[PDB]
Design a protein around this ligand. Structure first.
Ligand code: ADP
Length: 898
């Protein structure tokens, strides 16, 4: 083998570490038998020579860290990737947390012996390097790609930006990465990961569990007794799959055997298993200690764990132990009872999960007399940080805290420990959850998955109901059967839901078609759907990228079609199939309260459109607003859609944005609208890829429709002939058009005079949005003169990003002080100088101005103009300056957002 001293140093160091870090020294043969499949998969996936990045997937406690340590140790002895990988660097979140500002070169050199190859020399061939990011969920900073990404390793940079660049492969694209994340980590980082590869850890099996039990128990008879005892219990045996939970069960059984009491264990939930483990180890490890001193020791350990969790520190220096109140004898006591262990020259908890367990246990010792710790947050802060999706770093703690809220669990804790515990934790949690429920959902971005997990783990149906009924808008993603059962347990007895957003995949039968699972799955789905019909406030239902089958969707339609339900808005994204279409037709036919449909993103064909139009032809339909944005509808399919407008007189809003009609759908719609019988009032055709050829036909609509009022034809190549034809059509007062949206129509200022005519002649046009068009100072001048003409009944005018000039300001200055009916003007992205800004501000200050809303970006100006704008805002409380005034409103009206 090639001579290498970094490899030898890593081999020695992690060979030493492998015999102390794990809870028990598992035999090497048995361990490699347990995880042989994943080892082979990794060996096959890294023998292929941007290298793809593979991430280990699984819940906490399966052994991802141990697996990574074993793999890289085997590499260190050279039995793996001998001719593939030359240098492998192990990076853990806990050791990088203490780093404030340091370059990657120094980070790699901190453990790289000097008497070796230079770092630049080893980096000259970055195709042979592997960066194993282990336990990145223990980091103090979350990953959101907000920060800038760097490409140079030599230059000092912060840890967050370096990690982001390495993850996104903009820094050393040819390097290989090995990751280990949980389910929540995958959910948070799915967007960030590219070329992602998935490897799943399976844990222990039947024979593996038996062998591990026999290895843990050096004896035979009681070992077989314990194995049988865990065998008769289905839930305990299922939870025994995780090696850490298996070790917890083994040590709890050992404590029970050494105590002499009969084998008893509460295995309803994982948290119950943790509580039993802690109770029995505490009872077995303290027998000659007074209960006052026992309580003091437990409180000191709990405060230490809570401080470690809140400060994101997992290596405890003896100074920290002295500060928190831990003595040498107490340290020896916990080392003997196997709750802490040496990680070199410092101490660390036996496992991170036990660490947040003790951190949550700390909150049971609340003392009103004691002042706030100023470092550890209160219950409300912990709940907010755990249930919110921004950080989601102390979720597990909250979970344990939730289990501590139940009367039975706290009674068991008080009985076992012997000293009373705080009983206001449940009330405080309820108040905090109510407070966050009262907050607007947009500014909080609450992660309902963590809250639902806590509610499922607490097993308090009345408390679950009280918590769930606080929230009105529920967003949920269901990708696993465990997620499905958790959601069913949370929403079985919900009767306050009003807005539901569901992203549900990979759950209903696609593999393993056994008789069991699936029938129960359907029952779970029926229990979930029961919330739709059990609450008389259900308004909006949004199925985003959902994957249904025939029986599940049939059950959902049966639930929604009941007359007791009052669903109003149905937003179905990326879901339209033959069975899906038929079931949606059943929903539309049987529901009289349904009025708003948004099929944005759902790909449709000619047959699908024909079936939908045939269903809409039914006279029982009470549908009013219909949006089919980005449905890939062509002109011929519009032939069916037009037929709907022939019969459906209740419909009054139609949006067909982001289509490819190419004047054919426009011609068909105009021909349908020729009949003076349609009650359509709003039509949106943005980005329909249609030209001015059909615009003349649209002209014939404006002279024949007395009901159509709102027309949006934006983001279409209309040039000047189209807009001139539209103006000629709108010259006649007989037109009933009220609002016109012609942004990004690619017209110039020469045709603006025609617009300058219609603003004088049209007495019914209230809103005109001509933004994002190259109309220069000249066209601005004719528009301003048209407003100056004192017969213009125009209210809203949007000329954003029109490439205006400061010379136009004077023309604007006269307009705002002359047009009395002008209320809102959006003139964003205008270049202003001192002279133009001064006259504009004077015009705004002048009392003759009737403007109420001004769309302009104040931040994009120099100090003088910004100061003048602030002054004019101060002197005019009745005028509001804003940016992005109509973007969200336009998106909502077109259905792009929802
Ligand atoms: N195959 C196995 N045999 C014996 N013990 C295991 C095995 N896999 C994991 N463990 C134990 O489970 C614990 C898992 O901890 P860790 O390696 O940090 O992974 P995780 O982060 O998933 O908990 C380790 O302390 C280890 O002792």
């Amino acid at each position: 083998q090639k001579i290498n001293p970094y490899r030898s140093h890593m081999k020695q160091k992690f060979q030493v570490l492998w015999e102390k870090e794990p809870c028990l020294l598992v035999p090497e043969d048995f361990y490699e038998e347990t995880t042989k499949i994943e080892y082979e998969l990794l060996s096959t996936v890294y023998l292929d020579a941007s290298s793809p990045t593979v991430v280990l997937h699984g819940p906490e406690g399966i052994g991802k860290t141990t697996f990574l340590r074993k793999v890289m140790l085997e590499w260190a002895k050279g039995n793996l990737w001998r001719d593939r990988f030359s240098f492998v660097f192990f990076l853990t979140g806990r050791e990088m947390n203490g780093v404030t500002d340091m370059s990657l070169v120094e980070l790699l050199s901190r453990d790289w012996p000097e008497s070796s190859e230079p770092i630049e020399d080893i980096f000259s061939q970055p195709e042979r390097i592997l960066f194993i990011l282990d336990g990145m969920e223990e980091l103090k900073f979350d990953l959101d790609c907000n920060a800038d990404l760097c490409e140079d390793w030599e230059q000092p940079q912060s840890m967050q930006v370096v990690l982001q660049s390495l993850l996104q492969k903009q820094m050393l694209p040819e390097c290989s990465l090995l990751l280990a994340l949980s389910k929540m980590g995958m959910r948070k980082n799915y967007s960030l990961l590219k070329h992602m590869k998935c490897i799943f850890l399976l844990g222990f099996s039947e024979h593996q569990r038996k062998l591990y039990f026999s290895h843990y128990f050096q004896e035979k008879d009681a070992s077989s007794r314990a194995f049988s005892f865990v065998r008769e219990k289905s839930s305990l045996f299922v939870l025994c799959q995780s090696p850490f939970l298996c070790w917890l069960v083994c040590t709890s059984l050992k404590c029970q055997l050494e105590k002499g009491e009969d084998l008893e264990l509460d295995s309803e939930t994982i948290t119950g298993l943790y509580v039993s483990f802690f109770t029995k180890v505490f009872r077995s490890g303290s027998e000659t200690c007074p209960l006052k001193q026992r309580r003091a020791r437990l409180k000191s350990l709990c405060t230490l764990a809570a401080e470690g969790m809140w400060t994101c520190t997992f290596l405890f220096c003896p100074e920290d132990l002295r500060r928190n109140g831990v003595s040498e004898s107490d340290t020896s006591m916990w080392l003997d009872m196997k709750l802490l262990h040496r990680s070199g020259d410092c101490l660390a908890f036996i496992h991170t999960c036990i660490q947040e367990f003790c951190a949550a246990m700390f909150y049971m010792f609340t003392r009103p007399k004691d002042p706030p710790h100023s470092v550890i947050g209160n219950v409300t802060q912990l709940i907010t940080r755990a249930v919110s999706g921004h950080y989601s770093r102390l979720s597990w703690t909250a979970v344990f805290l939730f289990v501590f809220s139940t009367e039975r669990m706290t009674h068991r804790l008080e009985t076992s420990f012997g000293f009373p515990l705080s009983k206001e934790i449940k009330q405080e949690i309820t108040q905090s959850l109510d407070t966050l429920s009262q907050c607007d959902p947009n500014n909080v971005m609450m992660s309902f998955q963590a809250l639902f997990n806590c509610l499922f783990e607490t097993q308090d149906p009345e408390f679950v109901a009280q918590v769930v009924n606080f929230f009105k808008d529920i967003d949920i993603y269901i990708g696993t059967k465990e997620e499905l059962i958790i959601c069913a347990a949370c929403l079985r007895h919900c009767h306050s839901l009003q807005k539901f957003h569901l992203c549900m995949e990979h759950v209903f039968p696609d593999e393993s078609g056994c008789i069991s699972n699936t029938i129960e799955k359907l029952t779970l789905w029926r229990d979930v759907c029961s919330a739709f019909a059990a609450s008389e406030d259900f308004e909006i239902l949004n199925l985003d990228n959902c994957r249904f089958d025939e029986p599940s969707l049939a059950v959902l339609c049966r639930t929604l079609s009941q007359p007791v339900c009052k669903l109003r808005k149905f937003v179905c994204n990326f879901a339209s199939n033959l069975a899906n279409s038929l079931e949606l037709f059943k929903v539309i036919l049987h529901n009289p309260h349904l009025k708003h449909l948004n099929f944005y993103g759902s790909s449709l064909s000619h047959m699908d459109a024909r079936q939908l139009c045939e269903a809409l032809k039914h006279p029982m339909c009470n549908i009013e607003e219909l949006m089919l944005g980005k449905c890939d509808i062509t002109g011929e399919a519009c032939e069916d859609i037009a037929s709907v407008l022939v019969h459906n007189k209740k419909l009054n809003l139609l949006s067909l944005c982001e289509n490819a009609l190419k004047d054919d759908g426009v011609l068909v719609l105009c021909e349908a609208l020729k009949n003076p019988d349609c009650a359509l009032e709003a039509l949106l055709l943005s980005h329909c890829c249609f030209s001015s050829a059909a615009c003349d036909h649209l002209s014939q609509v404006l002279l024949y429709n007395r009901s159509l009022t709102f027309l949006d034809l934006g983001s279409n190549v209309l040039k000047d002939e189209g807009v001139t034809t539209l103006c000629e059509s709108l010259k006649h007062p007989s037109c009933n058009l009220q609002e016109l949206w012609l942004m990004n129509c690619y017209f110039t200022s020469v045709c603006c005079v025609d617009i300058a005519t219609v603003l004088i002649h049209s007495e019914k046009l209230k809103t005109l949005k001509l933004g994002n068009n190259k109309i220069y100072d000249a066209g601005a001048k004719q528009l301003c003169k048209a407003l100056k003409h004192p017969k213009c009944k125009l209210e809203n005018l949007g000329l954003e990003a029109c490439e205006l000039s400061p010379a136009s300001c004077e023309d604007l200055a006269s307009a705002l002080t002359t047009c009395k009916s002008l209320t809102c003007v959006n003139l964003e992205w205008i270049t202003l100088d001192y002279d133009g800004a001064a006259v504009l501000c004077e015009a705004l200050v002048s009392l003759e101005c009737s403007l109420q809303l001004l769309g302009l970006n104040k931040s994009s100006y120099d100090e003088e103009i910004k100061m003048m704008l602030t002054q004019v805002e101060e002197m005019n409380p009745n005028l509001i300056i804003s940016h992005h005034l109509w973007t969200d409103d336009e998106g909502r009206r077109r259905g792009i957002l929802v």
